[PDB]
Amino acid sequence: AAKEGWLHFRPLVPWKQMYVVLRGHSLYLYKDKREQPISVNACLIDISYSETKRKNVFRLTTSDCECLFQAEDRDDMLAWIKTIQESSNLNEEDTGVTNRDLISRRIKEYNNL
Amino acid sequence: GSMRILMVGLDAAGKTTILYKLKLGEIVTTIPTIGFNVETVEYKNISFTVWDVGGLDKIRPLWRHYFQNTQGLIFVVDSNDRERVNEAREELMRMLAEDELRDAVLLVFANKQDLPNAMNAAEITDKLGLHSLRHRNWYIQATCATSGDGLYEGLDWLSNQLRNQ
Numbered sequence: 001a002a003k004e005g006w007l008h009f010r011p012l013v014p015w016k017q018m019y020v021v022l023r024g025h026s027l028y029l030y031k032d033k034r035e036q037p038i039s040v041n042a043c044l045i046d047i048s049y050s051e052t053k054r055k056n057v058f059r060l061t062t063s064d065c066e067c068l069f070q071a072e073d074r075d076d077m078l079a080w081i082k083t084i085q086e087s088s089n090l091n092e093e094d095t096g097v098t099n100r101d102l103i104s105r106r107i108k109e110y111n112n113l
Numbered sequence: 114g115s116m117r118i119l120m121v122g123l124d125a126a127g128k129t130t131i132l133y134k135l136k137l138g139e140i141v142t143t144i145p146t147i148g149f150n151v152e153t154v155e156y157k158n159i160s161f162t163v164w165d166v167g168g169l170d171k172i173r174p175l176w177r178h179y180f181q182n183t184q185g186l187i188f189v190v191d192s193n194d195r196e197r198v199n200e201a202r203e204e205l206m207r208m209l210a211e212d213e214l215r216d217a218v219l220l221v222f223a224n225k226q227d228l229p230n231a232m233n234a235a236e237i238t239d240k241l242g243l244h245s246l247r248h249r250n251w252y253i254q255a256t257c258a259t260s261g262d263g264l265y266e267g268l269d270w271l272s273n274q275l276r277n278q
C-alpha cells in the first residue's frame with residue numbers, strides 16, 4: 001500500500017468509520033481492517049470547507065462518486081491528499097482533460113445550487 | 114441586495130485564504146485550488162456570492178467558464194511576486210478584453226503586504242497599467258489576507274459600485 005489508515009467516510013454523490021488502503025491509484029474501503037475500489041487516477045481532491053462542520057476532511061470527486069473522508073488531524077489529511085495526488089499515472093494532456101470535465105460538472109452543479 | 118463576484122489571479126496569490134478569512138474569520142489551510150470554491154459573504158446588507166477560481170497556469174483556460182453574469186471582478190496579486198507581476202498584468206488584461214465582462218467593476222487586491230519589500234499599491238497600479246482602464250470602474254486595495262487588513266474596505270468599494278447602478 002502507498003498509504004493506509006482509518007478514516008471516517010460519507011458520500012455526497014451518515015459518517016461511518018472505514019479502514020482505507022490506497023494501492024496504485026485504487027482506493028479500497030474496508031468495514032473491517034482484518035478483512036481486506038474507487039479509482040483515483042482521474043480525480044479532483046481538496047480540503048472540505050463547507051460540505052461538513054468537521055475539521056480535517058478532504059473531498060474526493062471522480063466521474064463515479066463524490067465523498068468526504070475525515071483524517072485524524074491536519075497533517076494526516078494533508079498526507080492523504082498528497083498520496084492520492086501522487087498516485088495518478090495520467091500524463092499532462094489526460095490530466096488536463098479529466099480536470100476540465102470534472103470541474104465543468106462541478107460548476108454546473110453549483111450554478112444550479 | 115446581492116452581488117456575483119469572480120475572484121481570480123495567479124496561483125498562490127491568496128484567493129482561497131481571502132475567501133475563508135471573510136466567510137469563516139479563519140486563516141484556513143489551503144492547497145492549490147484545482148477547480149473553485151464558492152461562498153456567500155454577507156456584508157453591510159449585501160449578499161456577495163464569491164467564486165474563488167484556481168489560478169494554476171494549466172487551468173487559466175477555465176476562467177472563461179465563470180465570466181457570464183459577474184458583476185464584480187476581484188483580481189488578487191501577490192505583491193511579493195515581482196517575477197510574475199507582468200504575467201499577472203497580461204492575464205488580467207486578457208480577461209478584461211472579454212465581452213461577457215464588459216459591465217464588471219474591478220477590485221484589485223494587492224495582497225501579502227506583510228512580506229518584506231512587497232510592492233505597494235502605487236507600484237502594483239503602475240505595473241498592472243491600471244490607469245489604462247478608461248471604460249470600467251476600478252479600485253486597488255492593499256491587503257494582508259492573513260490579518261484581514263484591507264479586505265473590508267474592498268467590500269466597501271464593491272458595495273458602493275452596486276449601490277450606484
Ligand SMILES: Nc1nc2c(ncn2[C@@H]2O[C@H](COP(=O)(O)OP(=O)(O)OP(=O)(O)O)[C@@H](O)[C@H]2O)c(=O)[nH]1
Pocket residue numbers: 122123124125126127128129130131143144145146147166167168169189224225226227228256257258259260
Ligand atoms: N505572507 C502572506 N501569505 C499569504 C497571504 N495570503 C495568503 N498567503 C499564503 O499564500 C499561500 C497561497 O495562498 P492561497 O489562498 O492558497 O492562494 P490561491 O490564490 O487560492 O492559489 P490557487 O488556489 O492556486 O489559485 C498560502 O500559504 C497562504 O497562507 C498574505 O496576505 N501574506
Ligand SMILES: [Mg+2]
Pocket residue numbers: 128129130143144145146165166167
Ligand atoms: Mg485557491
